[PDB]
From a paper:
P97 (also known as [name] ([name]) or Cdc48 in yeast)1 is a highly abundant cytoplasmic protein in eukaryotic cells. It belongs to the protein family known as ATPase associated with diverse cellular activities (AAA + protein superfamily). p97 has two tandem ATPase domains named D1 and D2 and an additional N domain at the N-terminus. Similar to many AAA + proteins, p97 converts chemical energy from ATP hydrolysis to mechanical forces, which then relocate or unfold ubiquitinated substrates. In vivo, p97 functions as a homomeric hexamer, a 540 kDa molecular machine with twelve copies of ATPase domains organized into two rings. p97 plays a central role in cellular proteostasis.
Our work started with the structure determination of p97 in complex with the cofactor [name]/[name] to reveal the difference between the yeast and human systems. We determined the complex structure in the presence of ATPγS using cryo-EM and single-particle analyses. Using 3D classification, we resolved three different conformational states of the complex. A homology model of [name] was built based on the crystal structure of the thermophilic fungal homologue. p97 adopts a six-fold symmetrical conformation in all three states. In fact, when applying a mask around the D1 and D2 rings of p97 and imposing a C6 point-group symmetry, the resolution of the 3D reconstruction improved to 2.8 Å, which allowed de novo model building. A comparison between our model and the published human p97 structures suggested a very similar conformation to one of the ATPγS bound states (PDB accession code: 5ftn15) with an overall root mean square deviation (rmsd) of 1.095 Å. In contrast to the complex structure of fungal Cdc48, in which [name] binds to the D1 ring using both zinc finger motifs, human [name] binds to the D1 ring of p97 with only one zinc finger motif. In both cases, the zinc finger motifs form hydrogen bonds with the backbone of an existing β-strand (F265-I269) in the large subunit of the D1 domain. Notably, when focused on the conserved [name] groove, we observed that only the center hole of p97 in State III is aligned with the groove and exposed in the top view; this was not observed in the complex structure of yeast Cdc48. Together, the conformational changes of these three states present a seesaw-like motion of [name] on top of the D1 ring.
Numbering used by the authors:
A (entry chain F), B (entry chain A): 12 to 550, 557 to 586, 595 to 714, 727 to 768
Write the structure that this text describes.
């Protein structure tokens, strides 16, 4: 699997956190059989490994009420490891823990507000009375005393980082008290759990970055060289910088961060000095990561660049990238939202040759993002994040963070009648009551302008075969053309046939060509890329479409509305010839399928049909009576149709209708039902100051206005091309 | 021959390595007749020359069990020469070897891990006890002693580089111990054996570079001046830098390396200083090579350049190139992947006038690359590198190195369930078991995006006359037009006729024009360049195509789908007029053949047909019955067709079918067989929870759906142009 690196090892050292019974900050309880397997004894000091490299040293005890697979700890231990209930930790024996020489501690500010008592005497001394509590640098623990308990932070240890607080150890609380904001900033460090919708890409990053650095011998043994340069790219706001901070906070390697604007804001000469210093300091620390965020800020195309300093930065960076000895254990990551603006010399072998695409999240990916962002918001109980994830079509992670911000602001606007902008301090009874409801999310949805609306979406469609009425033969052909070479490639090797990767749908308008392309991509669970003819004529970029379909294989590359390009024949001639050239180079990829659709088969370019490009000509015809019943059933699945409606009769009397004409009939019936329902409630309001389902009368009224969208002469010509389209090339 | 310089001289001094019997690190055994021919005696110290200029001094002995053509040595001697079993060395008498004054040695780190004993006393003294072992600087030898033997490196010799370790010689092991990584980096130096698919180009480089430098008198005697500038060019990743390191590590000349980005990363003034210093230091060392890697980094087109410093670098380089006295014995090599971005003044006589094209490797060349890269990988036994070489179509050497990396990573992913990313050290039982299987290579193939897919391939096609059915007369014409002027030029001089270098294939679509062009290029063993019409209309660059066909002569330059250009008549007018101009200038090359194909002969530009451009008009017609049998046989060669299938009957009932229509019939039959086979196995799985060959029923079902791709009126018009196409020019 591609995500095997992210899988939990499920070792016995892994344990699940539980709610403590009597265990204080410095002890943890386990089941006795667990120590028997782990050979742990009583009174042993143990080391806990958690999230974001956080550590803790505590005492392991025996619990007869502890589960085998779980560990016992209080909320303080759960806090110090950045772990939560239900999360997994690791445990290992901790030897060589010596008595503390001197521990430097300090309290949290908001705990010692208004308190003038001696912190050491009143709080620290009783808590450290012969208990032999093991502590580590950076730990936070709650100490009772006085009217209110105060938390303290271990800022320095003698020795570091583990020590035992003996009664002979010197405990001192001098120094500037620790602000809660300082600990709060460290509490909310980014981790791999703060990225949603990037599970596959996070697996790639771990293999490319964390594996060659933690286990360089694993690559020397298999006799391969790991990459030195990783280029994260994607649209703006998709979380490349967020992944940078996640790797910064959850890697064992030394991490150096370079900002593009930071480097180029410096004078001519301090930029190169800072670049050289970054790579030098990364080589001094053996396993290191250099992240160059906004790579295209410092390394644009040398052909398209005016200043001398910009060109000297790019050459300096190329030199430093080439100067990595491959024995230095330095990996250079970079992020960019304009991957094609980067100097081509920086994307070669040995320099940023591996690329990770942090693309647009899909509906489930962006539901995961929404849960991450709302995880600390005060949500109401009626808010359905699954729904919000479904309407947020063109949103990226930053668009969803902005959407949650706007929802919170709408919630505040509903409470401004209770607050004032000029209060010295806000009311206390409005904070606890302040919650974001699903209505605020609907409002924020109506006002959000996504930044990723105008760019190609590559995802499995939700259109299913059940959305299509009839075309059972075409469904069989499409399965045998798109699914068999992908699912049973050995069959195609047995008979020596190579599969054809192209299909042309043609026929009258509104008969289901677009639905068929999406439905076959959905059944095969293949990514779907749709490029309408108008999008091509308003566009170098055809090359990016085919490259995008190559990266996302198995893919169905749909070229819809080819008739729009054909009518434009100029720019349309270049577009078609580019597409033909790409389809010739595309034959290598055995799992990218190209589909074209046109309802003007008389003007299609004959070269499109050459054996090897789109030689499978499938004719989607105007639906017959049985298919019309099926179309009407398929369109009305989401509608409450009353049982007296005879779809058999509706399909009998609509003779030359398309699938889209039948959809328009159902649309009119819903419009009549909505009008009747709206009139009914206005009449009720009129008297005070119904229409649950679409009935047969609505379909009668809607159908006497039915207009047939394909002429009889049109049907004749389409039937003629059903026989003579393969002959269109030649004369 | 063009590769005569690479041929082994097969001198008596050449010997084949053998597995030692009793020979230790300082002795080598030979057959007694070999010394009789070589006049070598017993106890003589001898010098061994191996790969990458490595040397060794040892003692020659007499072996009655040694072959005449082979030499005896242990693994230590085999290691010190960078030679392997089956490889050839050279031998010569070594006189004037004096006693050592002081030899500075040091051990390898991993050999002395955990060992605190005295290296000299325990190891070095017993091994050097009166044995009079001859040693050289940089030698590595294994010395027994203690619980574990330790290897030592000779870092300095008094005198250098040969010395005799007398008992009176001072042996000392002080100094920082030698890391194995340091020796490992020197072990894996690049040599001419680390380049695959460039045998012809390596021969060119040796003649242009290593011959004028080793034997300048050989050029003064024949009265010619050797070139001073060699330009390696090719697509990115094709191994130009690799050849640079190979020449650096396997030439007797002083080698200076200049990096384009290195030079231009310096300040305005240190760049010119570094260039001048490089050429000065190359002239101080008499036979020298200056390699300027990434030439286009420092020397772009002065017309297309903005900075003043860039233009001063180009002028500085032109001055230095012109300043080579031709008596300095300095050769300047350069590499570039944009040979047309270089200043035209640098490709003139006396400056980079010789060019070597490190092009795309072909199937056998890239099999050689794959063997080089996997030679230290742990491959399984089922991996077929010949197959991988066949699917990797658009790959260059760097794409194949990346492909082997991805295969190794897939192998690791299959073993992550046994390893952990957080282990302090990896498991030992998973390394030895970790091997790359052919399944990992198929996966890496499915994910590889080659960088050389979108560029012209120049190679001999695999299409053979047996792939074509019928057209026996056309095959005779093509042989008499393409093969006779190449194979029997004296015949064409006898009769005073000059051959015509152009052919126009025309006729109905799908009748074999593309196959005929590839088949004649394959029979003549000529390079084949194909330029489809769409590729031209999406493109200065026509000039590069004809230049590329001129460099690769004997070549068949195929202009396929000329009908696509004709229908576009603009950009198409410029393309045709450019092609016509090139065909006029192309008549000089007597061994570049141009072929055009069109299935719209009614709109071909009449100037194409002028006597001297494409005046040979060959009409490929719609196949007759006998040819249809031949086409069906040719298409089904790779398919398991059952014997009851009557191809004679199939061809009888398909009357007006093209070659491509018959191929489509065979494709449908294979699709029906695949569907039946897939249904059969699903039925077997259905009952548990066949179709070995295509039978006559499949061809019956497939043929009732057969559609004829050429109309009867189309056939009439094509037959009319079979008589009146030469008349198309004039009115
Ligand atoms: N995949 C994601 N998961 C969770 N939060 C995300 C994700 N992507 C974006 N966000 C949020 O959006 C914010 C902005 O994302 P960034 O990390 O700046 O994206 P970006 O790749 O840097 O885009 P740029 O810098 O404009 S090219 C982050 O701080 C997160 O709060
Ligand atoms: N066979 C069908 N089954 C169900 N709904 C259909 C069918 N054909 C058309 N429709 C409906 O009519 C709409 C027309 O879209 P399609 O027919 O898939 O695209 P089309 O064939 O290119 O025709 P266009 O887009 O109007 S030119 C669909 O979105 C459906 O709502
Ligand atoms: N012909 C070849 N034989 C063997 N290995 C090769 C060959 N070509 C490339 N490689 C491998 O691929 C790597 C990349 O080759 P390079 O030397 O970078 O090619 P290149 O010509 O320098 O391309 P540039 O520098 O981007 S223009 C080499 O280090 C080898 O490991
Ligand atoms: N005479 C033939 N013998 C064998 N196979 C043939 C023959 N003619 C056509 N084919 C098959 O049909 C395919 C069509 O390719 P060609 O006929 O060589 O190209 P063409 O003549 O330019 O016609 P196109 O490419 O369809 S416009 C070939 O790749 C073969 O698979
Ligand atoms: Mg950013
Ligand atoms: Mg549509
Ligand atoms: Mg290079
Ligand atoms: Mg062809």
């Amino acid at each position: 699997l591609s995500t095997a690196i992210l899988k939990q090892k499920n070792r016995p050292n892994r344990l699940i956190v539980d709610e403590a019974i009597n265990e204080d900050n410095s002890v943890v309880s386990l089941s006795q059989p667990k120590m028997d397997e782990l050979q742990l004894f009583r009174g042993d000091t143990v080391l806990l490994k958690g999230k974001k490299r956080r550590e803790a040293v505590c005492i392991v005890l025996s619990d007869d009420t502890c589960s085998d697979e779980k560990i016992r700890m209080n909320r303080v231990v759960r806090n110090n490891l950045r772990v939560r209930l239900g999360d997994v930790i690791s445990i290992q024996p901790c030897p060589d823990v010596k008595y503390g020489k001197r521990i430097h501690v300090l309290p949290i500010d908001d705990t010692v507000e208004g308190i003038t008592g001696n912190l050491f005497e009143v709080y620290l001394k009783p808590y450290f009375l012969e208990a032999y509590r093991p502590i580590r640098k950076g730990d936070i623990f709650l100490v009772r005393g006085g009217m209110r308990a105060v938390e303290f932070k271990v800022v320095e240890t003698d020795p570091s980082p583990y020590c035992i607080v003996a009664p002979d150890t010197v405990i001192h609380c001098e120094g500037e008290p620790i602000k809660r904001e300082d600990e709060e900033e460290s509490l909310n460090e980014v981790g791999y759990d703060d990225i949603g919708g990037c599970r596959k890409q996070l697996a790639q990053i771990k293999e490319m970055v964390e594996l060659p650095l933690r286990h360089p011998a694993l690559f020397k043994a298999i006799g391969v060289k790991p990459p030195r340069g990783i280029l994260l790219y994607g649209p703006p706001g998709t979380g490349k910088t967020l992944i940078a901070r996640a790797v910064a906070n959850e890697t064992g390697a030394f991490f150096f961060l370079i900002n593009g604007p930071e480097i180029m804001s410096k004078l001519a000469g301090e930029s190169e000095s800072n670049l050289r210093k970054a790579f030098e300091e990364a080589e001094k620390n053996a396993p290191a990561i250099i992240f160059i965020d906004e790579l295209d800020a410092i390394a644009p195309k040398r052909e398209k660049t005016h200043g001398e300093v910009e060109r000297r930065i790019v050459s300096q960076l190329l030199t430093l990238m080439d100067g990595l000895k491959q024995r230095a254990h330095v990996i250079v990551m970079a992020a960019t939202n304009r991957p094609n603006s980067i100097d081509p010399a920086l994307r070669r072998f040995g320099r940023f040759d591996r690329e990770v695409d942090i693309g647009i999240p899909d509906a489930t990916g962006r539901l995961e993002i929404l849960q991450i962002h709302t995880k600390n918001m005060k949500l109401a109980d009626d808010v359905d994040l699954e729904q919000v994830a479904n309407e947020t079509h063109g949103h990226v992670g930053a668009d969803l963070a902005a959407l949650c911000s706007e929802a919170a602001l709408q919630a505040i606007r509903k409470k401004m009648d209770l607050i004032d902008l000029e209060d010295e301090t806000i009311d206390a009874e409005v904070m606890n009551s302040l919650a974001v409801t699903m209505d605020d999310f609907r409002w924020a949805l109506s006002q959000s302008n996504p930044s990723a609306l105008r760019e190609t979406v590559v995802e499995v469609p939700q259109v299913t075969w059940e959305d299509i009425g009839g075309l059972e033969d075409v469904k069989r052909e499409l399965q045998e053309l798109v699914q068999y070479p992908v699912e049973h490639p050995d069959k195609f090797l047995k008979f020596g046939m190579t599969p054809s990767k192209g299909v042309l749908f043609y026929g009258p308008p509104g008969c289901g060509k677009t639905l068929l392309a999406k439905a076959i991509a959905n059944e095969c669970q293949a990514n779907f890329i749709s490029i309408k003819g108008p999008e091509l004529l308003t566009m170098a970029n055809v090359r990016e479409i085919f490259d995008k379909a190559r990266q996302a294989a198995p893919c169905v590359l749909f070229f819809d509305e080819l008739d729009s390009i054909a009518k434009a024949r100029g720019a349309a001639d270049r577009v078609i010839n580019q597409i033909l050239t790409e389809m010739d180079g595309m034959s290598t990829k055995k799992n990218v399928f190209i589909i074209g659709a046109t309802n003007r088969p008389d003007i299609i370019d004959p070269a499109i049909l050459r054996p090897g490009r789109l030689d499978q000509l499938i004719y989607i015809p105007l639906p017959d009576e049985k298919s019309r019943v099926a179309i009407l059933k398929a369109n009305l699945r989401k509608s409450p149709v009353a049982k007296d409606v005879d779809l058999e009769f509706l399909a009998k009397m609509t003779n030359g209708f398309s699938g889209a004409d039948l959809t328009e009939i159902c649309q009119r019936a819903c419009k009549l039902a909505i009008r009747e329902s709206i009139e009914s409630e206005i009449r009720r309001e009129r008297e005070r100051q119904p229409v649950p389902e679409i009935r047969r009368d609505h379909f009668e009224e809607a159908m006497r206005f039915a207009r047939r969208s394909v002429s009889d002469n049109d049907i004749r010509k389409y039937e003629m091309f059903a026989q003579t389209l393969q002959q269109s090339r030649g004369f």
